[PDB]
């Protein structure tokens, strides 16, 4: 009860100290050469990022861990804008995230082994979101073959689009718990953390593939959109021009979908008008 909270304070402040000082100095790299031996704290940082409960976070207490990711992101960012990324770029990338990470997590199709899987799934998704927050994610992005970052577009489909569908065996449709809701949202944010997916995304939408059930049939894309509505339409809005042009023109023989998706565009656009005014007027003009 006390040793934890103490050392939690201590790590949080040492991280804060590093970032706000060993970086805010314009020639702080000389200080880095003074605090030369730091690989230790790098691994501590990354262990917190990846498995916070191991160190300090171990309290799980809402006020402290609320600010923990913010500090982590800021420190990560500082290490970006400063040199000495090699230790970052290596010691973080090649250890807490890899290609095999997504597949080796992807194996358990939300199995009854509940207390196990979505744990590390969520750990990874939170961590990667935090990375993108710091925007060092692309350094963890491995080299691919096409402008479309298969790295994450593929995990999109192979985790949800294939994942949500039991049509490969015509078994019972897997109901989603709020656990599944939040996990899916995280995965979607992941997919959308990388530019150049939306076209594939609408392809995943405007697909006349039909799901089976319970005997009724309903278009799989309709399920996918109806379920993850807010995140989808959000991201579609995030690149409104490209999505609009593709929705209009790449789409033929599309009655239900194109309608519904455009309505959703308009809707979730209006839903947030106090937040901004330059988002829908442009959407209106385009469509």
The structure was resolved experimentally with: cryo-EM
For Cα atoms 72, 234, 199, give the angle at the middle one, nearest 5 degrees: 105
Residue 280: count other Cβ atoms within 10 Å of its Cβ: 19
The Cα 238–Cα 126 span in angstroms is 21
Compute the half-sphere exposure of residue 149: CA atoms within 13 Å on the CB side of its CA. 21
Residue 8: count other Cβ atoms within 10 Å of its Cβ: 20
R_g over Cα of the chain: 22
Q: Which of 239, 255, 256 shows the shortest CA–CA distance to 196? A: 239
Q: How far is CA 220 from CA 20, 72, 157, 208, 277, in A?
A: 49, 39, 12, 8, 33
- The size of the chain, in residues, is 287
Structure token digits, residue 262: 């455009």
Structure token digits, residue 190: 């992941």
Q: Which of 230, 117, 96 shows the shortest CA–CA distance to 180? A: 117
Q: Which residues pair with 210 in a beta bridge?
A: 219
The Cα 128–Cα 151 span in angstroms is 13
Structure token digits, residue 15: 């991280």
- DSSP state at residue 142: P
The Cα 190–Cα 133 span in angstroms is 11
The Cα 92–Cα 46 span in angstroms is 6
Q: Which of 243, 286, 242, 239 shows the shortest CA–CA distance to 261? A: 243
Q: Which residues pair with 218 in a beta bridge?
A: 211
The Cα 173–Cα 45 span in angstroms is 41
Q: Coil, helix or strand for 167?
A: coil
């Amino acid at each position: 009860e006390r040793y934890n909270y103490s050392k939690c304070t201590v790590v949080v402040r040492i991280m804060e100290f590093t970032t706000t000082l060993l970086n805010t100095s314009p020639e702080g790299w000389k200080l880095l050469k003074k605090d030369l031996c730091n690989t230790h704290l790098m691994r501590v940082l990354v262990q917190t990022l990846c498995e916070p409960a191991s160190i300090g976070f171990n309290i799980g207490d809402v006020q402290v861990m609320a600010h923990l990711p913010d500090v982590c992101v800021n420190l990560m960012k500082a290490l970006k804008m400063s040199p000495y990324k090699d230790i970052l770029e290596t010691h973080l990338r090649e250890k807490i995230t890899a290609q095999s990470i997504e597949e080796l997590c992807a194996v358990n199709l939300y199995g009854p082994d509940a207390q196990v899987d979505r744990s590390r799934l969520a750990a990874v998704v939170s961590a990667c979101k935090q990375l993108h927050r710091a925007g060092l994610l692309h350094n963890i992005l491995p080299s691919q073959s096409t402008d479309l970052h298969h790295s994450v577009g593929t995990e999109l489909l192979s985790l949800v689009y294939k994942g949500i569908a039991p049509g490969d065996e015509r078994q019972c449709l897997p109901s989603l718990d709020l656990s599944c809701k939040q996990l899916a949202s995280g995965l979607l944010e992941l997919a959308f953390a990388f530019g150049g997916l939306c076209e594939r995304l609408v392809s995943l939408l405007l697909n006349p593939a039909v799901l089976s059930t319970s005997v009724i049939h309903f278009s799989h894309g309709e399920y996918f959109y109806s379920l993850f509505s807010e995140t989808i339409n959000t991201e579609l809005l995030k690149n409104l021009d490209l999505a609009v042009l593709e929705l209009m023109q790449s789409s033929v023989d599309n009655t239900k979908m194109v309608s519904a998706v455009l309505n959703g565009m308009l809707d979730q656009s209006f839903r947030e008008r106090a937040n901004q005014k330059h988002q829908g007027l442009k959407l209106a003009t385009t469509i």
